Write a protein that binds this ligand. Structure first.
Ligand code: NAP
Ligand code: BLA
Length: 205
């Protein structure tokens, strides 16, 4: 039985928007949780279901996860670099909702800093990185099938589907296009080969 129904968290963000468009075009029945539906586009592929609410509200997350086959997590803080627990608290709610509803597959984006030497995190990104680490811990300890996606710099290059995925943070470059990152999140829905692993997508454009 393959995945047909998915929830995407963070669908209005840079990577989320293209992951959403790609998922719908690929045939998935997609539900999104958004705080502000005006951030979803009118042109192009459209999600099947829109829940208005907040990943910090358990009931909103529960409504989004109910009935799904898998969950994609592309939560982030946009340009806000201050200390934060939004992603990890969101992940706690997602895990609880998954367990309440029998959903067992989550693919979630943090960053390659969780693979690279931690002394290399730029000071300005440390607070967000600390919450990525809390989120990764939550997902790893959940006992669900969890693919940790840890990308380098997210760029605007075209979709290629030709990127390289390593398990250790080394690879052909330190960039992945947002489109290729979304393509990889979707690839993780049709294989178990990355479950329980950390993954590093990168490409030379
Ligand atoms: N930028 C880089 O080069 C880079 C590199 C490696 C890793 N990353 C990490 O990759 C992940 C994806 O980044 P991105 O740039 O695609 O993301 P992004 O543009 O920051 O988008 C964040 C998404 O999270 C949603 N969100 C935030 N708080 C929420 C809340 N309380 N309830 C519901 N949704 C909420 C946002 O919703 P709204 O639209 O409502 O704001 C938006 O959809 C992030 O965790 C980022 O730190 C980024
Ligand atoms: C507004 C903040 C912000 C800016 C302007 C920024 C710039 C920035 N990010 C880069 C890559 C990168 N940027 C990130 C990660 C992130 N980038 C993010 O904005 C967030 C929120 C994360 C997640 C913690 C990563 C993992 C790389 C690896 C790119 C490389 O190795 O060269 C690079 C390439 C090398 C360099 O640092 O000189 C720059 C300049 N990074 C920032 O964080």
């Amino acid at each position: 039985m393959a995945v047909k129904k998915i929830a995407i968290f963070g669908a209005t963000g840079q990577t989320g928007l293209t992951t959403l468009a790609q998922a719908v075009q690929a045939g998935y029945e997609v539900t999104v949780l958004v705080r502000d539906s005006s951030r979803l586009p009118s042109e192009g592929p459209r999600p099947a279901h829109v829940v208005v609410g907040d990943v910090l509200q358990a009931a909103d997350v529960d409504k989004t996860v109910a009935g799904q086959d898998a969950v994609i997590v592309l939560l982030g803080t946009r340009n806000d670099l201050s200390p934060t627990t939004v992603m990890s608290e969101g992940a706690r709610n997602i895990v609880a909702a998954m367990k309440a509803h029998g959903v067992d597959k989550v693919v979630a984006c943090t960053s390659a800093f969780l693979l690279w030497d931690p002394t290399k995190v730029p000071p300005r990104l440390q607070a967000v990185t600390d919450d990525h680490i809390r989120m990764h811990k939550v997902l790893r300890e959940s006992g669900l099938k969890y693919v940790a996606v840890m990308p380098p710099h997210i760029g605007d290059q075209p979709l290629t589907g030709a990127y390289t995925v390593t398990l250790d943070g080394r690879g052909p470059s330190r960039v992945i296009s947002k489109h290729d990152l979304g393509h990889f999140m979707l690839r993780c829905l049709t294989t178990d080969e990355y479950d329980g692993h950390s993954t590093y997508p990168s490409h030379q454009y």
